[PDB]
Subunit: 395 residues, 4 copies
């Protein structure tokens, strides 16, 4: 990092995270993303929506969303038609890479005010008919599930992410029981944070037109913890000897999250109060079926970029694609669980894939405040072999 | 200018195949892998294993699988360690990818970057949007993914062809003016083809026989010009009084293109011969249905970023989304046609929408060399109201 | 003409309950429904084994994704011998009655002695079609075609739904929204009254739906009759012409699942194995006219069947005029001069349901019950079908 | 004694290849064409004289309400005509004619048109679970031809596999089936060359609104290549399989129709009959052994007609597969010199709903050309059944 123009986070906001075909399933991904952008900008005293110059928004399963999901998010949030808008896809890391690109655009001097984040409506992912143009003369055909194909299946092995999670349990020696106790713990932390009001600030509730109106205030998944059923359920990907289950994996989910970034000159020009400063970031990648432990490369790289030692981080967000992913990255990096996902993680909160990268950053800012920490680091792995990480200082 | 230098050390593109034509058997990542591998084979002293990061445009990503850009990279033989992000700014995706690639070098997060774009419009699927919840009764629709995600402005739900007519009405271009432009740009592409002026930039594609092999060497569309038929055809979007036709518009096409970018340090370190220098860039946007003349904002912005006067430019690439688009931006900017698309444009060459931003840049470098120019500017409008532009200096 | 040919006797009949669309019976396929009705009807005949059945005619309209020869599947599923001749019949809504006619004819030409005939329909399991995947469709949104609409409810010629031609019938013969609404209410009450009186218990063969190892679910009643709500019925918007329509969904027939079967034997096999005939087929008549006028096609087929039978309209004790819509019952009663007090005495398809391939047999099965309950001898069943046709049959209770 | 039934005429379309020369036509268009052609051949019979229609059609999905009604009306028949579609899979076309003859014999009609049609090119695919939905997972589009035409219900196996059964059951090798296929292809091409199909085939006009097109020939017979046919791989069992696409019948489009009249109507209108229906027979056995169900139905039809097997001048035994004609010839003891004299379904095509009427149509042209008097046509059908009919030419 060192001597480049500083980048400040002046706000952040997220939708509640809805369950698959659940509370938010009637909204499109641009609708969720617009809602988060609008709510992030409303929090900045002295910054107008018309000051936003550029948007990078993550989104993975973009089929049937329409032209440029980010542009639709931005216009739907009331930004000016002059706003530059780009949609980003690095699968599960899309939301964080979007924020990195936003910070880079300020650093290279091409913008002073950037909104970045991500959105996903997994409920509204369609099915594909791939061969209607040239036809298929004879034989049964397939309707491809867009979630499986473009979100959850490794391209080279043609295996779903749960089988990569099983590789992870084998590679790093985590049993069914260890994965279940981790998942119970992270559900408990998410429920405790919920009940204590600790998500109230970051969440922007959604009002659904009515019957009268419906208001969605809370993330849908945390309440679902039942530890007896969790410990008793059959494994989801390998019969008999499997370790990965639907309880101890992240679910399929709907949601969006956004941050507002400004340059140092704009912070002073508009007399803005920054929430946090971006200190650095890192992307890394390894063998695609081992994407589960790519954060163990991206996190040290972000820390080096930021000029910060790992021990000085007060809180980590390690995205819980599966419970085994958190366990393996904690083991490889030597990070105690006492510093990880202090308000729960994606296993209990949900995982709307194009949004999760920005979602955990929003939650991390809340964790640092609630726990009186200064330095935080978010790390998220992604299908294909990659991971992205970011370091922030709460001001 | 006071930003670190970014050098183009090579570039390459596939031939551009017609819709369901010569390249319809190849997926978008197969096309992009081909372009990437070809561009790298040109750099004396740089290995594919030296590439650190990839940005690749792709608009209609449905059924391509996880992260199109990652599939392109691994398909081209790049290391599993490579950072890969897919970019969607509709028709400008390929150029915005290169911009993001240059910024990643400028902020020092990479020294070797491959950027470009790919599109297989032949293999864009149809979507079944409502199978998860089901539909109890009634005929149901199968959404054409090209119309939905490539060609229809999300706000108005109007095809871009209709907004091209709005352009012809707004700026006073008749059927005849657009047709005569179309014929000139076809003749320029045929002349360039016959003179071998595309031979360097095109990497021919060998299709293995299941039967004899097939080598695809040339762009499929330039030979289709029939001036008699082009002048007599019915309008394509407005009956009777319409001025936009399939012959004077861009076709639907398959192809990919890629550039290799290095830092100043890495150029000296490996003693690499640079082809060109990126001098600056600019993105702009306006009212979505006026996307046709967004380049009239992006081009001056890129020139100001580059510290270059419009008069200093030796050749322009203005992407021919429609003939009327090139006419209108030439009129608004005061650029004579003899400086524009000297080897023809997308009306005659084809328009694989995710690749065209990088395709025109590849062609631009070929025009500067063939015509002994120094300074070039590429500009490309995109659905939603946007445009991107980039300035290069041939070394 | 009939006396010059062998006699044909009905020795039993059975029907499943009629399920609502995606309702109580939606887990079963049309051959499972059909096999259930065949098996129930044969178990009623004392002195006759299922292996004595020689031929099967079975109606079914929307046969897509049902598999090879639905009738064969119903016959084998019911435990019939693999030597059984099986043919599926499609005369749209009349298919179940036309299958019975062809069964009767097959005995009368001497080509069989024991015939099972009826029909089946699972409208819940009718699929959607993708019509152009073989040759392709290079560019443009395409259509997933609802098989019920295409092959069941739309006139081929005009490409218009039957409800719109039910409207045509209403303007043709002067029946208001009020007159259809109040007839609908009456046939719902007749159906509910029959239900509460137990008058369907004999003809209905309840279906046992298996459990996940756990007792079993049992569908005993028709699902539609309980849904009568006279407030909502008179207040609902019309279904086919906004604002000025008379035909509504409550006074039309529903989409439904169900099957029905009768057993037919020649005069020789009756006396041979000593069987108790329930009824005798006295004659039948098919007729057809303008496709959009199918609603009044029973007014041609019913007289033709009576003439074939050598019986008078005033001699008939009960009529089953199938209620595709309330207006077709109104219209045919007006054209023929038949008073409602002799028509659909346990209710009709508006209240019971209209599994289209089965309904022609369903009304015959109910007709035999009406005659037993109301102490009658002569019944006439008549049913219109999309395309312009109708079929009618005349029975004498023994 | 029940009234006699006379065939006064019959016609059939050219048989088109799968997705071929007739794929632009729907099954009712093909069916209407064949009805109006057979009606044009009769002097003194007006189209308004037809009272009832029975038409076979198997894969009826997306054809619209009552294919037989559409065929009748498209052919110009009166809206008063009674129309029923019949499905006994491959026997549908012949079972309809049997039903039509019975409708005359019970006195309910004096003029019936019967036959069959199939457009396998235009059979759709099915999405079976859209009404209740499927929340997560890849889904199937079912090929209507496989599901409703070519797959036995209980075994869930394609008909090609039932034919490999018939080969192991009665002992016919890959070479014994391929030689028969070549012989039938050559028999088919000799009839075309000798004009022996031109009477029965009503050509179709596909006009340009573009150049005009007229299909007059059957598309399949010209495709014979004995070198390619001998050297292809098996289609249903690798390595050891004996059944292939060349020695099997194809997927095809086509229609055939016959005009039937009573004794009294023949006399009243002074019509000149082509043949007389003498008897018929339906039989069935184990579903996967349907290939040899004709060995039951053919005797039953000869029995019902009061003629013996050695009195038949020509047999049309439908060639669902080359092995099917070979097996049934072995069981009934029929010499091939008396079988499918102008070729069969393996060379001519097999539009399944129509073939039962198609082979009867061709039988009458065989009987006329070979100066024969007694013909028999039998046809197996998926599900385990078969239908047979005996005609005497007049
Ligand atoms: Cl990756
Ligand atoms: Cl835009
Ligand atoms: Cl009809
Ligand atoms: Cl059968
Ligand atoms: Rb604000
Ligand atoms: Rb302020
Ligand atoms: Rb809040
Ligand atoms: Rb979970
Ligand atoms: Rb190289
Ligand atoms: Rb080259
Ligand atoms: Rb063009
Ligand atoms: Rb019994
Ligand atoms: Rb009962
Ligand atoms: Rb109703
Ligand atoms: Rb005639
Ligand atoms: Rb002819
Ligand atoms: Rb063949």
């Amino acid at each position: 990092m060192s001597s480049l123009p500083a980048v400040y986070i002046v706000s952040s906001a997220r939708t509640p995270v809805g369950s698959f075909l659940g509370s938010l399933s009637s909204l499109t991904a641009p609708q969720l993303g617009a809602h988060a952008i609008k709510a992030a900008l409303a929090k900045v005293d002295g910054l107008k929506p018309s000051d936003v110059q550029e948007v990078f928004f993550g989104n993975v399963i973009s089929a049937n969303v329409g032209q440029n999901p980010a542009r639709q998010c931005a216009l739907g949030a009331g930004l000016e038609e002059s706003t530059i808008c780009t949609t980003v896809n690095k699968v599960c890391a899309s939301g964080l890479k979007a924020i990195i690109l936003g910070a880079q655009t300020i650093m290279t001097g091409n913008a002073d005010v950037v909104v970045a984040g991500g959105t996903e409506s997994m409920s509204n992912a369609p099915h594909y008919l791939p061969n209607l143009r040239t036809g298929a003369k004879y034989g049964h055909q397939s309707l491809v599930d867009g979630i499986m194909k473009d979100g959850l299946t490794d391209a080279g092995k043609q295996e779903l992410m749960g089988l990569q999670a099983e590789e992870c349990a084998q590679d790093h020696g985590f049993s069914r029981e260890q994965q279940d106790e981790y998942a119970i713990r992270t559900y408990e932390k998410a429920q405790a944070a919920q009940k204590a009001g600790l998500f109230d600030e970051e969440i922007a509730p959604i009002q659904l037109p009515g019957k009268p109106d419906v208001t969605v205030t809370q993330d849908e998944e945390p309440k679902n913890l039942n530890p007896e059923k969790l410990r008793a359920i059959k494994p989801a990907f390998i019969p008999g000897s499997g370790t990965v289950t639907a309880p101890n994996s992240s679910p399929l989910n709907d949601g969006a999250a956004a941050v507002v970034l400004v340059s140092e000159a704009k912070l002073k020009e508009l007399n803005l109060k920054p929430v946090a400063k971006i200190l650095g970031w890192g992307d890394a990648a390894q063998q695609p079926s081992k994407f589960t432990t790519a954060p163990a490369l991206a996190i040290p790289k972000a820390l080096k970029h930021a000029g910060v030692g790992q021990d000085a981080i007060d809180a980590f967000e390690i995205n819980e694609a599966f419970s085994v992913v958190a366990l393996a990255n904690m083991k490889l990096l030597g990070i105690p669980e006492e510093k990880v996902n202090l308000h729960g993680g994606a296993v209990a909160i949900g995982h709307p894939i194009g949004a999760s990268g920005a979602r955990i950053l929003t939650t991390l800012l809340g964790v640092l405040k609630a726990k009186k920490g200064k330095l935080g680091c978010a790390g998220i792995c992604n299908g294909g072999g990659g991971a992205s990480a970011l370091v922030v200082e709460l001001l």
